[PDB]
Each structure stands twice: as C-alpha cells, then as structure tokens.
Amino acid sequence: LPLIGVTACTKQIGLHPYHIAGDKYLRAVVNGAGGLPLIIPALGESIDQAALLDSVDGLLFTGSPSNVEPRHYSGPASEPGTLHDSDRDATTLPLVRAAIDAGIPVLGICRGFQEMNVAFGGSLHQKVHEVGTFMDHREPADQPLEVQYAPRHAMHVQPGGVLAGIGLPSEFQVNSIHGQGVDRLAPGLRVEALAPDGLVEAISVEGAKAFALGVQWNPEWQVLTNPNYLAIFQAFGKACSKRAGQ
Amino acid sequence: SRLPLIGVTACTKQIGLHPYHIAGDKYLRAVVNGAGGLPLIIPALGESIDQAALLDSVDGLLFTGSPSNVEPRHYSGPASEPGTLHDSDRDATTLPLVRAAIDAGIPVLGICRGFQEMNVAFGGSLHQKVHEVGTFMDHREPADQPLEVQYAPRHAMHVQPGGVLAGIGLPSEFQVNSIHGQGVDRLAPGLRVEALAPDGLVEAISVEGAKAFALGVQWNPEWQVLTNPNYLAIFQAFGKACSKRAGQR
Ligand SMILES: N[C@@H](CCC(=O)O)C(=O)O
Ligand SMILES: N[C@@H](CCC(=O)O)C(=O)O
Ligand SMILES: [Mg+2]
Ligand SMILES: [Mg+2]
C-alpha cells in the first residue's frame, strides 16, 4: 500500500492543543485510493519538510472549515469572525510547492484546492456568494451531512487535461460546500473544470512530473457511491502506487 | 542519515457533525525534539487498515496518553462506572497493533494510556481507580491547577535493576509526573517490571525477549521533554531504536 499523507488542521480541545483530520478523508484514501492514510501534523517549519516528502508516496490536502489567511495572496483583511488556521497555512503552502517540484502526487480538496491556487501565486474570493453573478456555493444550513454533501451543481470538464484523461464525462454533478473560491488563477495552472457560473473548480499543475490535481468540490464524500469521485481517487491512488513502487 | 518515521496513535473525537482522528501536539513535538523523528499520526481505523502494511511503513510507534480508558472487557474486568470515558475505535486499533509491532521488531514506546494498552494487550489487567484500591497514593493530577502544575513531577520512581531503564543508565530513583486514575493490577505474562512508584504500583514495563525496543511508562515523559533529562533519555533511546530500523530500509 502507498503511504498517503493527509493534512491535519489544528484545534484546541479542552486543555490541550491537537492536530486533527476528518474520518471521511481517511476512509476515502482507504476505499478510493487504495492507500494507507497517515496524518501529517501542522508543525510548519518544525519538521524537516524534505524528509517528510521523502517518506510519503502522495499527499491529500483536505478540506476544512477554516480559510487561508488573505495575507498569503495580498488580499483584503478577512471579516471579523472568519475562521483561520495559521499553523495549517504554515505547513501546507510550502509543502504544496515542494511536493510538486519533487514529484510527489498531490490531490487537493476544497480548502486544499484553494491552497494549491494560493501557493502558486493566485488569489481567492473570500465570499463567492457576495461577488455577484456567481452562484451561492455554500452548503445548506441546518441539514444532515447527507444533504449538505449531496450533488448540487453541474461541473464542466475542460478537454485535454487530467480529468478528461481519466475519462470523466464532459458534464457531471458535484457537491458544493464552500464560501471561498478562485479569483486570480495562479500562473502555471491548467483549468480542469468550470462550474456553470464560470467559477474555476478544478486545476492541474502544468508540466508537473507527477499527478497534481485540485478540485473545489468534496469527492471524498461517500466516494464508493459516486463513479466520478471514485475515478478521481483511483487515479490519485495509481500515481501514489507508482511512487511507492519507486 | 534517514530521519525515522514514527507513527503516533490517534484518538477519535466527534466535533460537530463530523468524526475526526486527533493527536496531542505535545506528543508530536516530543517525537521531533526528543526522539529526532518525523511524526505521522495513525488513524484509529481498526481493521479497515492492513495492519501489516502499517507496520512496514513505520520505523517505530508511540502509543500516546489520552483521557479515555481501555474498555475493561479486554482484560475481563468489571464494567466501568457510569460516565467513564472510553474510545472503542482506538482500542480496536492499538491492542492488536501492540502485539503485532513487538512480534515484528518495530520499536514501541507507550505513554500513560499507551502503557496501560501494552499491559492489557499482553494479557494483564488494570485497576480502574488506583486511588480507591487502598494501598496506592492518588496518582491523578491535582484538580484546580494549571497544566504546568498538573504535569510537574509529583512522585518518585524506583528503577528495578537489570532491564531497559537501568541499561539506559537512569538513576535508581527519579521524580516523575502522574496524571492517571488507572494503573496496572496484574502484570501481563512476558513483561519485565522496569520501575515502581513508592507505593508499589508498576509504572514501567518492557517486553521480555522482544527483538526491538519495547517500553511502556505510566508517567508522561513528553511533557517539556527537552528540559527534563530523565524524560529525554527515554525518547533518545526510543529514537535510536527507530533509527536502527530506518537504517534497514
Ligand atoms: N473554508 C473554505 C474551505 C471549505 C472547505 O474546505 O470545506 C471555504 O469556505 O471555501
Ligand atoms: N485515562 C487513563 C490514561 C490517562 C492518560 O493517558 O492521561 C487513566 O486515567 O489512567
Ligand atoms: Mg461549488
Ligand atoms: Mg503515577
């Protein structure tokens, strides 16, 4: 089994600080990518990043309720109350760039897709639903997970990239659990898919030595019941297996 | 030299509507600072994982402390009192993993709950309330105190000669912190007592005949490990064992 590192978030739980990761991301690595998920703590520069990269066969940058701090893309200060995770930002943004340069497969989901865009020099809309023209991409409030993570808008694959290459249909439906989204696309990123309002919702890293894909939706959700989500996780898993085989 | 990849056991926690796997920052920083390793957190996924693949992927394992308690059915103990904190998903991960790791020669360090896991995994039992048995001190942390006091040294620890701790050179007595309501009752077969609290409670064990480093301690040596040499020595010994395994990669 390939060793797939999964990014942690930080959280104070009672008296103590913790590093946490969502069960559903870990189960998707097992059930969809065929990998062994181990959680990468959000320790930033305290860890030798190069040693961390040498030790994993791929990286999953997970979603999170928190938001990339806008200073990393020279954005406007966030509204009071906005959730941030500075320790995660300090870990993931340098890790993305280093992983892609070293040829470690990368899959970014939701916040992790936003991280990929910011890490390569792009910017975000902090409230897509207040921009105008764009849909409200947030999940419905006061609903169970099954409703929040159900398919809610279409997704239009752009030919000639990773998603077309794995054989996804030209249009398929995706879930949508995000209040932020891509504003300026980072240089060197290929657009892989667009929402029907034109929002960029998937990207790949041009010229990357290994699999390097980010998606704005949440394909870890019940991955075995969605052939499109599963196809993405299986392609990521194959790339990780390639690395593990060395 | 290859930094050893040290797996650190997670606990489960429901946060809102989502289940999470969690691990304490102070354990992870002790792996970096004290053992010289790269910590990755092992989810509490039980049988959903190929345990053999997990063992092949790590150079050592740290079984962490936790507020939760091993479920007493695993040592045929009486049902726990109402409200006792348990983590059945962690138990389903760690008890088989301990045995398999030591059988395969993967270095193991167990701290507090993780030391209790080691004793239970090999067939031993626990006292669910050490402070109520009658012959032990109260080994829990003091109630209305901040962490720096709760995790400070609070009782002595007496090394039993001839084992891992004496081999590390630790003194015959040293002070340790104490943040635990449970403790060893019956030692498991195949375990060597390494140290006793002054009341006689077994607070450290090693596995007889293990191919590789296999140590559990009931105190919490991750706490401020860098400035406590008696704690640091344990993490340094663990880290050296993990590095030996990494060198066979
Ligand atoms: N907080 C970010 C990421 C969401 C997520 O990963 O679920 C947003 O609202 O877009
Ligand atoms: N809950 C267990 C373990 C404590 C801990 O690991 O901190 C006890 O009270 O003994
Ligand atoms: Mg959307
Ligand atoms: Mg004690």
Cα gap A241→A199, rounded to integer Å: 32
* Chain A contact probe: residue of B1, B6, B17, B21 with most A CBs at under 10 A: B21
Copy the structure tokens of residue B100: 């398999």
From B8, B22, B68, B69, give the residue whose CB has the most ligand 2 atoms within 8 Å, as the site to mutate.
B69
User: Based on C-alpha coordinates, what's the Rg of chain B?
Assistant: 17
Where b means 16+ CB within 10 Å and e means fewer, A221-237 reads: bbbeebebbbbbbbbbb
Q: Which domain range does residue B51 map to?
A: 5-247
State in Å: Cα A155 to ligand 3 middle: 9
Q: Is B107 exposed, middle or buried (0-12, 13-18, 19+ CB in 10 A)?
A: buried
**Cβ B51 vs Cβ B235: under 8 Å:** no
Query: Residue B182, annotated ligand binder?
Result: yes
Cα gap B245→B232, rounded to integer Å: 20
Reference B70, options B89, B51, B83; nearest CA is B89
Total number of domains constituting chain A: 1
Find the largest Cα–Cα distance for chain A: 51
Query: Residue B80, annotated ligand binder?
Result: no
A11 touching B (Cβ < 8 Å): yes
A142 touching B (Cβ < 8 Å): no
Cα gap A43→B39, rounded to integer Å: 10
Copy the structure tokens of residue B137: 């001190």
Residue A231 φ/ψ, nearest 5 degrees: -55, -40
- CA-based angle A149:A1:B87, to the nearest 5? 60
Verify whether ligand 2 is closer than 6 Å to residue B197 (CB atom): no
Q: What is the domain-level CATH number for residue B168?
A: 3.40.50.880
Residue A245 φ/ψ, nearest 5 degrees: -65, -20
Residue A206 φ/ψ, nearest 5 degrees: -65, 140
Residues for chain B: how many in total? 249
Copy the structure tokens of residue A70: 């806008």
Cα gap B183→B127, rounded to integer Å: 5
Give me the residue from A15, A36, A48 closest to B147, CB to CB.
A15
Give me the residue from B3, B28, B32 closest to A19, CB to CB.
B28
- Token pair 């691990």 is found at B23
**Which residues pair with residue A125 across a beta bridge?**
A181
CB proximity list for A120: less than 8 A, separation 6 or greater: A96, A97, A186, A187, A188, A189, A205
Residue A39 φ/ψ, nearest 5 degrees: -90, 130
Q: How was this structure determined?
A: X-ray
Contact B40 A40 (CB under 8 A): yes
Give the closest-approach CA distance of A184 to chain B in angstroms: 31
Give the closest-approach CA distance of A96 to chain B in angstroms: 17
Cα gap B206→B214, rounded to integer Å: 5
Query: Residue A125, annotated ligand binder?
Result: no
Q: Which atom of ligand 2 is nearest to the CA of B66?
A: 6
Give me the residue from A8, A24, A51 closest to B3, CB to CB.
A51
Reference B118, options B16, B180, B187; nearest CA is B187
Q: Please give the interface size between A and B, counted as residue pairs whose CB atoms are below 8 Å apart.
A: 108
- Between the alpha carbon of residue B121 and those of residues A59, B47, B207, the distances in Å are 33, 16, 11
Q: What is the DSSP letter of A173?
A: E
Give the closest-approach CA distance of B12 to chain A in angstroms: 9
For residue B214, give the H/E element and its range: strand B214-217
What's the start-to-end Cα distance of chain B, in Å?
A: 11
Find the largest Cα–Cα distance for chain B: 51
Query: Residue B112, annotated ligand binder?
Result: yes
Cα gap A21→A2, rounded to integer Å: 19
- CA-based angle B178:B184:B185, to the nearest 5? 135
Residue B82 φ/ψ, nearest 5 degrees: -55, 135
A34 touching B (Cβ < 8 Å): no
SS3 for B161-187 is CCCHHHHHCCCCEEEECCCCCCEECCC
A22 touching B (Cβ < 8 Å): yes
**Cβ B51 vs Cβ B96: under 8 Å:** yes
A3 touching B (Cβ < 8 Å): yes
State in Å: Cα A189 to ligand 1 middle: 20
Reference B10, options B18, B20, B22; nearest CA is B22
- Token pair 């941030």 is found at A84
Query: Residue B180, annotated ligand binder?
Result: yes
Q: What SS3 class is residue A235?
A: helix
Q: What is the DSSP letter of B157?
A: E
Copy the structure tokens of residue A175: 């879930």
Reference B36, options B8, B6, B57; nearest CA is B6
Reference A246, options A56, A23, A106; nearest CA is A56
- Specify the amino acid at residue A159: P
Nearest CA in chain B to A51: B3
Tell me how far the alpha carbon of residue B178 is from its chain's centroid: 13
* Chain A contact probe: residue of B15, B27, B57 with most A CBs at under 10 A: B57
What does the CA dihedral A229, A232, A235, A241 come to, rounded to 10 degrees? -80
- Token pair 């940058």 is found at A61
Copy the structure tokens of residue A147: 């409703």
B23 touching A (Cβ < 8 Å): yes
Copy the structure tokens of residue A199: 């929002």
Copy the structure tokens of residue B60: 């050592």
**Cβ B188 vs Cβ B120: under 8 Å:** yes
**Cβ A111 vs Cβ A64: under 8 Å:** yes
Cα gap A191→A88, rounded to integer Å: 25
**Cβ B218 vs Cβ B203: under 8 Å:** yes
Q: Is A97 exposed, middle or buried (0-12, 13-18, 19+ CB in 10 A)?
A: middle
Counting ligands in written order, the one closest to the CA of A218 is 1
